[PDB]
Symmetry: none
Subunit: 226 residues, 2 copies
């Protein structure tokens, strides 16, 4: 089971690119699919989404009228037509599957991302970065600009790696993530806690509200070494 | 005239692509599982990708799934690695290696090709050490799990193909008597009884017990 993005590259301002996202191991046609991007000044930014049958589409305001999302459910392929590209569109672009997990919605499958370079409800996380050692207890906080009940997910993004779903619905651990990771909170203040930091836990962590559209992420919390 | 030769490296901006090739000669390439293994200054050795003998089954490390594609042309005795959407973290020397079986080890490597872009854990100690000719050198490896004697040691000189020294914790490859391996379970030690001048090199341990195959960060043996 994986998603594989292709089509990135270097493009002049005002240029065009077409990204494709090839899905495998699951019934692609059954799932809402989305593009999410991260610019060199990071933080995840939802770009666009499309319903399972391809009839309903959505875009972030910053890409309206320039990007077009589509899908070929017969070839398990998602597309993003990017016209009139701008310097600010420089980013890694992720393809992601939206899943109803228990009674909640999360992006539970992501691709590794493709790089686009152009040249010739608010979520607040704290801290923005922290340095720690192996064995340390790490506390990361997310505050929501509104009550969102337990409609909150946490993602882990290792350096140079695709983001990964850690916790959904504020406290529910995703399959495979170890017990040291734990989430708590409801309403407007949420906590991700790593009970004992391991070397593979050095990463950037993102919260994301799943309560009202458009989906918004926190700016990220960088967990650095030393 | 048994050898592997990698080509296709170079310098690339982030997000670019390269295609590495590994040319095999002197053995029946089509019969063997083939692998790519890479080395950055920080990580030691890191297994990247493997492909079954017939080219139909492939495997990738988590750090490169979906960006790298391994394939083989068994009619031209050639392994390939297509690297798309390259990252700074992919900067490494890339080796192609043949997997060999009693025990499982990487018994043949190429000299490597350099790419610049601009879960059982093994811990080795020391990371570097200075010694003289005639010295006894003791290198230690610890596994995050019991792995009985499923543990190999490699030697790597600058710019030369890595070399299999000891497999199954204590068994010498067809390698001088001064080299000696011991340990089982979770603690292993590599011993050079009397350092020779051609013995100044970087050494790596590797567990052959559970997939994915993992290496220690390496022990650099320097002069002084």
């Amino acid at each position: 089971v994986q998603l594989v993005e292709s089509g990135g590259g270097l493009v002049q301002p005002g240029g065009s690119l077409r990204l494709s996202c090839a899905a495998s191991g699951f019934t692609f046609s059954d799932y809402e699919m989305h593009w999410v991007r991260q610019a060199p000044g990071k933080g995840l930014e939802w770009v666009s989404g499309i319903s399972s049958d391809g009839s309903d589409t959505d875009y972030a305001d910053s890409v309206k009228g320039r990007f077009t999302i589509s899908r070929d459910n017969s070839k398990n392929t998602l597309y993003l037509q990017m016209n009139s590209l701008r310097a600010e569109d420089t980013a890694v672009y992720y393809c992601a599957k939206h899943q109803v997990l228990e009674e909640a919605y999360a992006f539970d499958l992501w691709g590794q991302g493709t790089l686009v370079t152009v040249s010739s409800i608010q979520m607040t996380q704290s801290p923005s970065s922290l340095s720690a050692s192996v064995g340390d207890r790490v506390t990361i906080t997310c505050r929501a600009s509104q009550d969102i009940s337990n409609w909150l997910n946490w993602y882990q993004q290792k350096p140079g790696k695709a983001p990964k779903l850690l916790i959904y619905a504020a406290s529910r651990l995703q399959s495979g993530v170890p017990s040291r990771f734990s989430g708590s909170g409801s309403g407007t203040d949420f906590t991700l806690t790593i009970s004992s930091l391991q070397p593979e836990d050095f990463a950037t962590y993102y919260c994301q509200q799943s309560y009202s559209f458009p989906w918004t992420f926190g700016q990220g919390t960088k967990v650095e070494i030393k």
